[PDB]
Nucleic acid binder design. Structure first.
Ligand SMILES: [Mg+2]
Ligand SMILES: [Mg+2]
Ligand SMILES: [Mg+2]
Ligand SMILES: [Mg+2]
Ligand SMILES: [Mg+2]
Ligand SMILES: [Mg+2]
Ligand SMILES: [Mg+2]
Ligand SMILES: [Mg+2]
Ligand SMILES: [Mg+2]
Ligand SMILES: [Mg+2]
Ligand SMILES: [Mg+2]
Lengths: 50, 50, 417
RNA sequence: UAAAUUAUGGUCAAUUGUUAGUAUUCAUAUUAAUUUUUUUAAAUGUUUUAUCAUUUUAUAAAGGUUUAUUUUUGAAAGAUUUUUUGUAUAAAAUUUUAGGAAUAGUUAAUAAUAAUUUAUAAUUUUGAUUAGAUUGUUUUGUUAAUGCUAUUAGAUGGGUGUGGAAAAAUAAAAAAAAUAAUUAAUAUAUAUCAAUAAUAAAUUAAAUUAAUCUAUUAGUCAGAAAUGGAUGCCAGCCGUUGCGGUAAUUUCUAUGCUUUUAAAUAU
RNA sequence: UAUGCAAAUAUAAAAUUAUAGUAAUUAUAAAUUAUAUUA
């Protein structure tokens, strides 16, 4: 390496870092804009999903 | 977004083509990717053991 | 040392989703046309001789002095699935699965299937996506058909978009409101543009003018633009773009039409980075990893892996002519010891008489799936007795529906057993 | 006239107005300001001394200046027994008015000269002098940005000429020759030009010392939000196209209703 | 009908008018408009 004859491994030779073990299902997290009555999302109460 | 020339890999190409190894273990050891101390510090930052 | 963090770059649009790519653009994903060798290249025999040029010197390709036996390097396949990808993919393969019809894919994955009138022929079964419709403006123009006759025609400007990287805009002048809406929509699908999202926003400034409207599309940390221009740029799935129309916002001309046509024109003038890199005949920094396995087994080819068998080229020409075929009676009991007797039984390809060796039942099966005077055949004798074809099984008759004696039936089938 | 690597290094430039055929930085936007609010100022008597005197105590009055403002240590600092030195007043740059003409105790040499020394003098069209406006060369606002747009205030001639230096006639907030005082920063109700207060502007309570305050506006055609009732080209609205001709979602009034909640409006 | 006098479109410019304080703009070109002696 010191005389510059060592075969280079640089960050240029790296492809994508793959997802190997797939995490988990991300279940839908209830937000303030998901409500079965249009009332619970009011203008006087709810200013946004969170 | 760097654009390399066509022959950009030549130096490394003749370095690889002319390499030689005492045994085959030296040929592919897992750690040939690493030269400086910065390399060893990036490769093991995860295990607080190592 | 780069104080902008890639961690926080972007603009929340609230509910508006946009797509992002984990690595490359999805069209570039499945490469199967080069992998499974469907290309015109392979079909034209020409140039296949070139895999084998080492044959041009006979005593050499035996001797193996030169390490280059192959087109691109040391052998014909060193890395088949890696090397070639180092060219920027200008014309990616895209979606190649034919298991359904184009219209079935279209039907399932796209709302666009429900509105067959709004789409031109070239795009008809071609879309897998859902499109949003945004109506920018309605307006009224007077249309004079004659010096007395006057009609009120209306005028639509809208843009179709899907945040998955595809949008388009249209405008039209028609008699009714609904009419101009539909017209504008098919005019917008005629003009559809797409954007390469590998880069997620323009990497250089685009300075371009629509008619009288000077537009600047430049790289930004997030999306910054007029509300309308902004969700137009969101319709393409741009995270990092930012864009400005006409210097000062008060500058003439300014119409809703102008605002739309401007940003669409600008985006239509944008060049992808890969395209730029190929344009100069150069290798992009992003695509170099593909060369790695190649470069790897250059390094690793020393020693035995570089060695070829002395004397042997791998090309073995035919010399003699070999035929092992046999007359049927010879192969009737040929494989009895290796396998069971009657080895070739119902085999149509491997026998000149497909029905020989068969026991009566299996012979009857074939006709069974297959299906003039006052005489009774044995067929209707069975129908009036109600025995079908199965009950006769110890009797030499196979075809019940022929008019012939039992002895005839015996002699016709005799060679079979 | 060749590429380069021992690989992201030398530390963030990044632009958001709903328009009305077209050409041209020009109405309605944000930020910054004036409109707009008494949480930072303040009262008269300076003071020693050897006595009618003599020592100490040096740039906020006005006037309007654009080739313009420049200086010492001999005072004090300041230390030895007495004579102690030299360096300074000068210049160079940057200088405004839409449409432009002459200015003048006057230049240079002589010299401690000349209200009448000598000379073919000096300033000006490369913009003078008068005259208007104006407090000059680290200070602001806007902006991604060469820009555009601010910056106060303070040196106004001489005439017994003191003093180191004229800066010398109310208007401090500079301890002024014995330690006045430091347990002080609080100053009541005045001013000048500054100094951005609607400080969780609305539900669980203030690890206080409970002291100041009782606090509201807009719109309602286009573009979030409408109905009655009047009115009838009138009265009136008007950021803007424009509205008002008995049915006005654009005027007035009543009631509701709308707002993304430090206000509308004007400059 | 070029012996006196006489600079002057051939473009160096910042929205129209207006002697450079007046009004709020102005200017602009191809849609549309029935009779011109063709076998
Ligand atoms: Mg090298
Ligand atoms: Mg305008
Ligand atoms: Mg003064
Ligand atoms: Mg003056
Ligand atoms: Mg000067
Ligand atoms: Mg001077
Ligand atoms: Mg005097
Ligand atoms: Mg509305
Ligand atoms: Mg009103
Ligand atoms: Mg009435
Ligand atoms: Mg009404």
């Amino acid at each position: 390496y010191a005389r510059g004859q060592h075969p280079s491994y640089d960050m240029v030779y790296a492809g994508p870092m793959p997802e190997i073990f797939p995490m988990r299902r991300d279940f839908r997290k209830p937000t303030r804009w998901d409500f079965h009555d249009i009332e619970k999302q009011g203008k006087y109460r709810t200013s946004g999903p969170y | 977004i760097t654009f390399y020339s066509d022959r950009f890999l030549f130096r490394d190409l003749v370095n690889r083509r002319e390499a030689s190894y005492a045994n085959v273990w030296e040929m592919d050891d897992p750690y040939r990717f690493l030269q400086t101390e910065q390399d060893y510090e990036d490769y093991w930052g995860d295990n607080y053991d190592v | 040392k780069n104080l902008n963090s890639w961690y926080t770059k972007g603009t929340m649009r609230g509910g508006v989703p946009r797509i992002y790519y984990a690595w490359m653009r999805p069209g570039s994903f499945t490469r199967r046309r080069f992998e499974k060798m469907r290309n015109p290249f392979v079909d034209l025999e020409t140039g296949t001789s070139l895999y084998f040029r080492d044959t041009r010197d006979s005593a050499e390709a035996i001797a193996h002095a030169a390490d280059s036996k192959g087109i691109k390097g040391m052998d014909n396949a060193i890395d088949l699935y890696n090397e070639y990808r180092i060219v920027p993919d200008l014309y990616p393969e895209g979606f190649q699965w034919k298991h359904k019809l184009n219209t079935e894919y279209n039907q399932w994955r796209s709302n666009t299937w429900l509105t067959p009138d709004l789409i031109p022929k070239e795009h008809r079964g071609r879309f897998l996506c859902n499109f949003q419709l945004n109506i920018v403006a309605y307006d009224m123009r007077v249309v004079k058909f004659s010096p007395k006759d006057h009609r009120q025609w209306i005028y639509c400007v809208l843009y179709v978009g899907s945040g998955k990287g595809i949008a388009g805009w249209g405008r039209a002048v028609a008699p009714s409101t609904q009419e101009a809406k539909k017209e504008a929509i098919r005019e917008a699908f005629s003009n559809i543009i797409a954007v390469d999202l590998e880069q997620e926003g323009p990497m250089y400034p685009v300075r371009v003018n629509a008619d009288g409207v000077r537009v600047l599309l430049y790289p930004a940390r997030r999306i910054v633009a007029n509300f309308r221009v902004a969700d137009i740029l969101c319709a393409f799935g741009f995270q990092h773009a930012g864009c400005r129309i006409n210097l000062k916002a008060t500058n003439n001309p300014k119409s809703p039409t102008h605002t739309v046509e401007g940003v669409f024109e600008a985006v239509k003038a944008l060049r992808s980075v890969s395209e730029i890199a190929a344009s100069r005949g150069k290798v992009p920094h992003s695509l170099i990893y593909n060369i790695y396995p190649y470069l790897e087994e250059i390094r690793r080819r020393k020693g035995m892996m570089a060695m070829h068998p002395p004397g042997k080229d791998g090309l073995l020409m035919p010399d003699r002519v070999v035929d092992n075929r046999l007359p049927d009676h010879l192969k009737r009991g040929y494989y009895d010891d290796v396998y069971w007797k009657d080895f070739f039984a119902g085999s149509d390809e491997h026998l000149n008489e497909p029905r020989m060796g068969l026991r009566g039942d299996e012979m009857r099966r074939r006709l069974e799936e297959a299906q003039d005077t006052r005489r009774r055949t044995l067929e209707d004798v069975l129908k009036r007795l109600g025995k079908t074809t199965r009950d006769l099984g110890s009797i030499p008759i196979v075809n019940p529906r022929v008019d012939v004696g039992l002895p005839t039936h015996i002699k016709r089938n005799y060679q079979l057993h």
